[PDB]
Amino acid sequence: GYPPARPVVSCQAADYENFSCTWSPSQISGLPTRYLTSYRKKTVPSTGPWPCPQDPLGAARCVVHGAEFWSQYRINVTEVNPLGASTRLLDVSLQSILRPDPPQGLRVESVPGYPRRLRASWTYPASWPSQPHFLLKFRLQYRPAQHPAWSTVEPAGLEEVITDAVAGLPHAVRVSARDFLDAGTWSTWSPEAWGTPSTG
Amino acid sequence: GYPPARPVVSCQAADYENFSCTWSPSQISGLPTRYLTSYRKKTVPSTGPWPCPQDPLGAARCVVHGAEFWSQYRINVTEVNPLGASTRLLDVSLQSILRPDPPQGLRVESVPGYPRRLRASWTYPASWPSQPHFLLKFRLQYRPAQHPAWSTVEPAGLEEVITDAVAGLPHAVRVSARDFLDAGTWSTWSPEAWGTPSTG
Amino acid sequence: PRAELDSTVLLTRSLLADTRQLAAQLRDKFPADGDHNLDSLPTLAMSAGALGALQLPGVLTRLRADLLSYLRHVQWLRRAGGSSLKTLEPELGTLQARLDRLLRRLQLLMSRLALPQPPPDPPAPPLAPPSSAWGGIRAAHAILGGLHLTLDWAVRGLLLLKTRL
Amino acid sequence: PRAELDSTVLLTRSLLADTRQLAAQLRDKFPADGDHNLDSLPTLAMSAGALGALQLPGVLTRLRADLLSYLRHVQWLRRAGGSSLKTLEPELGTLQARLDRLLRRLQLLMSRLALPQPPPDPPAPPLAPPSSAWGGIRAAHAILGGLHLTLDWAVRGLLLLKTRL
Amino acid sequence: DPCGYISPESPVVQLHSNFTAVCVLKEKCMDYFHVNANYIVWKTNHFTIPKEQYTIINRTASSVTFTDIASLNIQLTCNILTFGQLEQNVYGITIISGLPPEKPKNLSCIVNEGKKMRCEWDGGRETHLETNFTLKSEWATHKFADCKAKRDTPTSCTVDYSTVYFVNIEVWVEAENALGKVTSDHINFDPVYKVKPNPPHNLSVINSEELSSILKLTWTNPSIKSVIILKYNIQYRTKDASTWSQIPPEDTASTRSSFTVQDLKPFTEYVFRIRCMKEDGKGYWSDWSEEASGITY
Amino acid sequence: DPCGYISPESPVVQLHSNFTAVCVLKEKCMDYFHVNANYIVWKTNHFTIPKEQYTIINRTASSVTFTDIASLNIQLTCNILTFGQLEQNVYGITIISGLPPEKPKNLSCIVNEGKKMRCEWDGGRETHLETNFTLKSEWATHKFADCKAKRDTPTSCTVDYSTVYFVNIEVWVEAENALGKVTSDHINFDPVYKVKPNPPHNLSVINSEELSSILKLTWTNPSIKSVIILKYNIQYRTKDASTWSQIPPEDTASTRSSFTVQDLKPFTEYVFRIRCMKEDGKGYWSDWSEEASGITY
Ligand SMILES: *[C@@H]1O[C@H](CO)[C@@H](O[C@@H]2O[C@H](CO)[C@@H](O[C@@H]3O[C@H](CO)[C@@H](O)[C@H](O)[C@@H]3O)[C@H](O)[C@H]2NC(C)=O)[C@H](O)[C@H]1NC(C)=O
Ligand SMILES: *[C@@H]1O[C@H](CO)[C@@H](O[C@@H]2O[C@H](CO)[C@@H](O[C@@H]3O[C@H](CO)[C@@H](O)[C@H](O)[C@@H]3O)[C@H](O)[C@H]2NC(C)=O)[C@H](O)[C@H]1NC(C)=O
Ligand SMILES: *[C@@H]1O[C@H](CO)[C@@H](O[C@@H]2O[C@H](CO)[C@@H](O)[C@H](O)[C@H]2NC(C)=O)[C@H](O)[C@H]1NC(C)=O
Ligand SMILES: *[C@@H]1O[C@H](CO)[C@@H](O[C@@H]2O[C@H](CO)[C@@H](O)[C@H](O)[C@H]2NC(C)=O)[C@H](O)[C@H]1NC(C)=O
Ligand SMILES: *[C@@H]1O[C@H](CO)[C@@H](O)[C@H](O)[C@H]1NC(C)=O
Ligand SMILES: *[C@@H]1O[C@H](CO)[C@@H](O)[C@H](O)[C@H]1NC(C)=O
Ligand SMILES: *[C@@H]1O[C@H](CO)[C@@H](O)[C@H](O)[C@H]1NC(C)=O
Ligand SMILES: *[C@@H]1O[C@H](CO)[C@@H](O)[C@H](O)[C@H]1NC(C)=O
């Protein structure tokens, strides 16, 4: 046979306290299989190899709790078979890897008296505990039905009144989230919610 | 009686070698009269008082020959009567006081073929000996008959072709002279000479 | 809810955006391959998870020591990084100027809150000059690839302080 | 009728006009009452009447000594005459620059005509600074109220030289 | 080796005030010419000062007194009547006149995106004197570098320090000349409320196929959007109209990068222009954007 | 504590030429990562250089060869495959490219009355490199101060020495950049033949009462008349005409301060404009004067 190939590793984090990384085999040729997982904090305090515990004790995923938020970590995922190793080393910084879940409970409502205004509301994602140090910024998009191009606004807070809604027309609305200090990356778009401005 | 008043003194020079100064009494109250004349070269060589000889031995005028051209002279004309003196002191620099006589023999002629051209010619003044170190510059003026305003040109040499003569009309022409290195002052205007451009 | 604390947080958030943008602009023109380090920069090791507990003296003391070192390094770059890095002005110089004010802004904060002042510490000896123009640029990635963590940790830390006073 | 001599005469005539104009401009703004003197300027005593006789060596030697002193005094004025006389620039500075070239122009003349060169003379010690700003202006009338005689005597003298070589 | 001097050396006086000039002759010169104070004559700008305005204070000094100074520049010269015919210059001084600088008013500053802070102020009455204008600025515990105005544009300065948003800065201008020093009011403000962003660019008008009476505007906001929330004003008219119309301000009170204009006439060409400013109305309106044309589908 | 370096430090090369870059790793770094030359990877402007262009010269150095350089600016970076997954930066250099300056042609100078000598020249093909232009000037036995061109206006200089008429001056421009130095031709000329006087001012048109078909022009010549004899061009047309007429040049070939225009239509308004230049036609025509209007009596 042949030594294992390098496994494919991705990490992610939807909150600011713990993060987690995952890995997949790049090839199903090594029949018996096992994974060595570890990580260290690179410096410029035994910051050596610390085990990454595998949560339901069999899955292809380990979690690191109480990670240093600003430090950079070097994750060491090692595939081993009875014939060798092919350690994958993957750099991860909590401040870089973070990606929150989309906001929840997005509802869009008409604004009586204004045939071209809508009020949008939504909540934080459940994976992000509301805490005064890490808010989230939000980005709202709206688009009239049958039209191809999105319009983008950057709402303050959990609500946004749209002012250029086409009169008498259903509007689709979706939103995404990012750490309020531009840490990590923008969330995926929420499921679209539909509303129609009031008449008059 | 009373001491004499300061006499009135003027100097002049129409050439670059000798110059001459004149003086008049400011008052005819001192009956017997006599004049003391002298001059010195101010420095910054007995440059003291040198007599200024009175030419036809009675006139109100003395001449200084072989004067320094660039130096400044302080002329001392002293009126004396049996009762006192009132020395007039007058500063004179040959380079400042010089004023040539007008050019001579000014003639104006038509220019055949050109109904609005005239050729002007003239000679040096007799008081200025032609010598290669001190030329004279010339200034020509022309004016059509009955018109009030003069036109001025600055001819090179002893001739000048006027090119803006009014057709069919008599033109008056007069000229004046000055040392070619702008020493001294411009001459008085020559007597006007008249000419009329040719026809055709 | 001090009037003084909201304003300082706003400038750190302002400065953080400038630093992230400049780090990304820098990586766009002079790419960096790998995590760059400098022995002289401070280690910003403190977990946001276990960050609530730390009270008022620690956040302010840590920011001043870290930020003062970073100011020196940014200021140091504008002197000796090499002509190759002249293209980051005037954006780099604006960062230097605003960063200087924020260190000043923090010192004013300590006086108005009547907090015990740290002893005048002994300034660190000079940093050796870069060994090359590109060595200065590699140093630049490390200096302001780190300055957007100190400021990042400042916004986070200062927001904690607002929750108390 | 040397090609070199006509051109030098033209520049002296050019420079003479500039100096007369500047002296008259100066008297228009800062009138002078009386003949001003400086112990350091040369006496230009030579009669144009008895000036034909003087041959080639004397005219060139005398112009260089006189003009070199005048250059120093004009140059001296632009250093210490006082702010009151700043209004004569840039006309005064142009005179200084052109005058410097003419002294140079004369030295080139001596080499091309293979005339014996004067010995490198000992430069005159420094002129004391003016006692006042107005003292410098009064000195200015004397310096360039004299410089339009040396140049005046140069045109006249150089024209004599053309008549011989 | 002058004969004497005039004091004061080079005075500057206020218009309509009084000025006394004293000319003093050195003893050595006085002996040489056999003269004294009664022989001093004063001249100014080629004009003989009338003898009745002279005052002999002692045999060594003469003086004149000017009242209601009305000349912006007076050249005063002192001369002596040595032999009584020849006038020689003793000394001279230049008298400059004017007014003290007026207290600068309507002091205002502006931060053009990408440029350093610039302040403008209204100068008052012309003073006829070289007046220096220096912009003083300090935050609260340290004073930063001064702006010495340039002769050109005497009412403006562009600081040498980079703009710092979110910190209150104390600014004022001090005007000073030989006759006086004065300071503007000590206004106090945060540069973030004095920003004049550049206008939006890359403005595009797009023809939607559905709803022939609707056009969507898109554009790129100015970089200053990272510090303040922007508000904008979109004006539009038909390609042939003479005046501009305007979207209701309430509909455009917060940062966005697009807008759909409705109730437009079908298959008609419209021209748009836009400007933006800080959401709270505190600051200056930006300049007008590039012109844009569009046609509905 | 870098791992290695690339030589040459910061080269400048000619477009379409060849360039070889060598990256060398220090021994200490090589031991630490357990690598050698075969592990060096080259990247430029975020683009991976294809492996086939690399050349391992020895275990300590790797090299690449560029042919037909077509990029004005190439950022070259050398990186190492330490663990074989993680890329770390070893060194970097900036490659700048362009062309040597072309020999300046159409070199010309001009002396605007009241201003110092100014020279203009035609730059050739764009070189894409910072190219310095230096005006060299010397009379014959001493060289006077150099003009280093300003970034703005790369084709012009205004000397720092006052203009000196009547002396032949040798002038030329030397263009130089990292890839080459070149000089313009060594033209030789007297500034007096390159004067561009300012145009006549105080132009006046006067209505003579006699001869209703004659108008006299008067004006003040430019100060440059003290060094050269001026020639002028007077153009005129009726207040309603569309094109200008012109007095015969032969009639205006020498310095004067007035001219009587004849054969004009009676009681008709005429507009005049004038320009002047050196009598021998050697030099540049001045700009047009201020416009002038007049009416015959
Ligand atoms: C990532 O983690 C893996 C898992 O530990 C690391 O592999 C480890 O590599 C070391 C060698 O550096 C092995 O050490 C052993 O030493 C003894 C004594 O000589 C010898 O008998 C063994 O054959 C081996 O050499 C260690 O065993 C091995 N781990 C395991 C579980 O076997 C890997 O080095 C890490 N990658 C890094 C830190 O970059
Ligand atoms: C201009 O010229 C006149 C004419 O010479 C000058 O007048 C002269 O003045 C001196 C005094 O400086 C007189 O000197 C005499 O001295 C003897 C001895 O003490 C005495 O007896 C006389 O009474 C007189 O003081 C001299 O006589 C007198 N000239 C004549 C002809 O009598 C005048 O000074 C000159 N002005 C200047 C140089 O400014
Ligand atoms: C003649 O009057 C002048 C007027 O200024 C005197 O000059 C002043 O003299 C006093 C002496 O106490 C000094 O304090 C001043 O500074 C002088 N001022 C000036 C402008 O000179 C001068 O001393 C007087 N001489 C006599 C003999 O009385
Ligand atoms: C490996 O190759 C590099 C190629 O440059 C060598 O470096 C050169 O070494 C020579 C030694 O004679 C020097 O003269 C050059 O100046 C060096 N140039 C550079 C760019 O390094 C290096 O010495 C070689 N090493 C071995 C062991 O052969
Ligand atoms: C001198 O000054 C006084 C007071 O300033 C003033 O009243 C007077 O008119 C001035 N002029 C004189 C006295 O000639
Ligand atoms: C005006 O500013 C200039 C520039 O430094 C200075 O030299 C001058 O003295 C100033 N004028 C004053 C202070 O009156
Ligand atoms: C290298 O240079 C030579 C000569 O300049 C040229 O012929 C060749 O095309 C260049 N490129 C190569 C060899 O890849
Ligand atoms: C261009 O001129 C500047 C100005 O001194 C100089 O610093 C630079 O080296 C010059 N460029 C050259 C000589 O390539």
Residue numbers in the entry:
A (entry chain C), B (entry chain F): 88 to 131, 141 to 296
C (entry chain B), D (entry chain E): 14 to 178
E (entry chain A), F (entry chain D): 4 to 300
What is written in the article reporting this PDB entry?
Interleukin (IL-), an IL-6 family cytokine, has pivotal roles in autoimmune diseases, fibrotic complications, and solid cancers. IL-11 activates downstream signalling pathways by binding its two cell surface receptors: the IL-11 specific receptor, IL-11Rα, and the signal-transducing receptor, glycoprotein (gp)13013,26. Following the formation of the receptor complex, the Janus kinase (JAK)/signal transducer and activator of stat (STAT) and extracellular signal regulated kinase (ERK)/mitogen-activated protein kinase (MAPK) pathways are primarily activated. IL-11 and IL-6 utilise a homodimer of gp13026,34,35 while other IL-6 family members exploit a heterodimer of gp130 with a second signal-transducing receptor, such as LIF receptor (LIFR), OSM receptor (OSMR), IL-27R/WSX-1 or IL-12 receptor β−2 subunit (IL-12Rβ2).
